[PDB]
Amino acid sequence: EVYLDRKLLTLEDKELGSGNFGTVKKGYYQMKKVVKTVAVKILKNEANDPALKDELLAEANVMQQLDNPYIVRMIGICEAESWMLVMEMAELGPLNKYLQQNRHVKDKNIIELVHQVSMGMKYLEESNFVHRDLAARNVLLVTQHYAKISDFGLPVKWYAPECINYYKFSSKSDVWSFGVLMWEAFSYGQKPYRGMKGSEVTAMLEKGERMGCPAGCPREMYDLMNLCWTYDVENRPGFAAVELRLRNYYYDV
Ligand SMILES: COc1cc2nccc(Oc3ccc(NC(=O)N[C@@H]4C[C@H]4c4ccccc4)nc3)c2cc1OC
Numbered sequence: 001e002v003y004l005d006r007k008l009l010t011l012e013d014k015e016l017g018s019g020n021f022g023t024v025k026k027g028y029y030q031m032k033k034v035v036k037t038v039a040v041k042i043l044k045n046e047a048n049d050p051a052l053k054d055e056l057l058a059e060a061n062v063m064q065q066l067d068n069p070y071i072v073r074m075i076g077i078c079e080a081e082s083w084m085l086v087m088e089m090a091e092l093g094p095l096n097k098y099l100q101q102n103r104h105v106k107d108k109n110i111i112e113l114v115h116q117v118s119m120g121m122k123y124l125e126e127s128n129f130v131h132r133d134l135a136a137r138n139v140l141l142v143t144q145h146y147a148k149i150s151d152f153g154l155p156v157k158w159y160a161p162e163c164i165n166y167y168k169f170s171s172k173s174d175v176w177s178f179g180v181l182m183w184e185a186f187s188y189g190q191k192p193y194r195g196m197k198g199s200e201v202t203a204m205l206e207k208g209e210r211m212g213c214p215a216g217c218p219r220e221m222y223d224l225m226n227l228c229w230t231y232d233v234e235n236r237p238g239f240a241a242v243e244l245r246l247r248n249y250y251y252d253v
Helices: 050-064 095-101 107-126 161-166 171-186 198-205 219-228 239-252
Strands: 009-018 022-030 035-043 074-079 083-088 139-143 146-149
Touching: 009 035, 035 050, 035 074, 050 074, 050 083, 095 139, 095 171, 107 139, 107 146, 107 171, 107 239, 161 171, 161 198, 171 219, 171 239, 219 239
Parallel strands: none
Antiparallel strands: 009 022, 022 035, 035 083, 074 083, 139 146
């Protein structure tokens, strides 16, 4: 039953995150003999907009009809003192913030994590789902060796050129964002195109220029980022090609 019993759920007073339309808190959902740690998105509806409740429910339906090990999964919905979306807890939080704080993580560890992300993306691609906001801030870590894609806003610097010029989003558009995500990861959560305005990024890319190889980044991986950054979408690989290339590389090394 996706509808959860409120008596079985206990929340912490502190918020992990917040926004205009919701708050995320840590909680515990009571199960048979064990207790499960969960993240709960509590809806904030200060203008009493029935469309807001429908969005929370639409988002829960997607989480459910989109289920894979490399995506944040839905536990259920809880119609309590507020509408709540209960999901798995990704303890370590966002990838970019994690890497900024843990400079000891090795290049091998970062290949394993982005390969998992390429696995969740290969999955959304097969379901004909376009994320549109893939970035390191939307990869949440369960452990240092286990990443899950999330979609908080279900960002010009993560956009493929054909998104800016023609607003054409596709899985190949998501492949370009994945390339920026890999650059963020091997850079340890550094901001891409730092200090540049979104217009300067566009002009830089149309000159055939791309971000350099981050320090310590294996060359093979930088080569994959550059392929993710192929200007002409026709020639840009999809996620099946990207994931397979990552898989082989991670299984060899
Ligand atoms: C302390 O670290 C934190 C740990 C967290 N663990 C799990 C979930 C968290 O927040 C959320 C809240 C809402 C969402 N919605 C979400 O993705 N819907 C979109 C439809 C589903 C989706 C997923 C993948 C790809 C496309 C769409 N996803 C994470 C967490 C937040 C945290 O800190 C703020």
